[PDB]
Amino acid sequence: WIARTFYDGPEKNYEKTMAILQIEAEKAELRLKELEVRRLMRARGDGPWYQYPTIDKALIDHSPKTTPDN
Amino acid sequence: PGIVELPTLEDLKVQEVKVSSSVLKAAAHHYGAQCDKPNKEFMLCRWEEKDPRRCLE
Numbered sequence: 307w308i309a310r311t312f313y314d315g316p317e318k319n320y321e322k323t324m325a326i327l328q329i330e331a332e333k334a335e336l337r338l339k340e341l342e343v344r345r346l347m348r349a350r351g352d353g354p355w356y357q358y359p360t361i362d363k364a365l366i367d368h369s370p371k372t373t374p375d376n
Numbered sequence: 377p378g379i380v381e382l383p384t385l386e387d388l389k390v391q392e393v394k395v396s397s398s399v400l401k402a403a404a405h406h407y408g409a410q411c412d413k414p415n416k417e418f419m420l421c422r423w424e425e426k427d428p429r430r431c432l433e
């Protein structure tokens with residue numbers, strides 16, 4: 307009576323634990339991947355992150371400048 | 377890095393104009409009216425090449 311009224315079967319806890327373990331394992335591998343990606347991006351600078359600003363080339367004046375040799 | 381090339385003195389020899397600034401100013405308008413084509417060609421070459429060594433002729 308106690309088992310029927312207050313508790314459930316072992317399969318419920320078993321599968322819940324499996325789902326939780328899978329979720330946490332994916333989270334851990336994602337954290338490692340994010341750390342590695344951050345390290346590589348900061349070391350190289352070829353990714354969208356750590357793109358420090360540079361001088362815009364649209365500000366340059368392309369016209370004769372009173373002197374042929376610029 | 378690299379060697380700067382410079383034309384020899386024989387390439388820079390030419391019959392200079394030995395008149396003063398006042399003489400040039402007196403005929404400046406007529407000089408510009410008459411000698412416009414070679415001067416404009418030289419000026420265009422000067423602003424296009426951006427190199428004095430490319431406009432001696």
Ligand SMILES: CCCCCCCCCCCCCCCCC[C@@H](O)O[C@H](CO[C@H](O)CCCCCCCCCCCCCCC)COP(=O)(O)OCC[N+](C)(C)C
Pocket residue numbers: 310311312313314
């Ligand atoms: C002859 C009898 C001998 C044995 C006597 C046994 C006595 C048992 C009383 C002790 C109860 C405490 C154990 C569990 C309480 C909470 C556990 C909880 O999970 O159960 C809830 C149910 O518990 C009851 O609602 C609460 C128990 C309280 C009743 C005790 C009686 C005396 C209380 C005094 C009240 C005061 C009244 C006013 C006084 C003036 C809901 O369960 P649920 O999470 O959905 O489970 C889902 C699985 N399903 C689908 C199979 C159901």
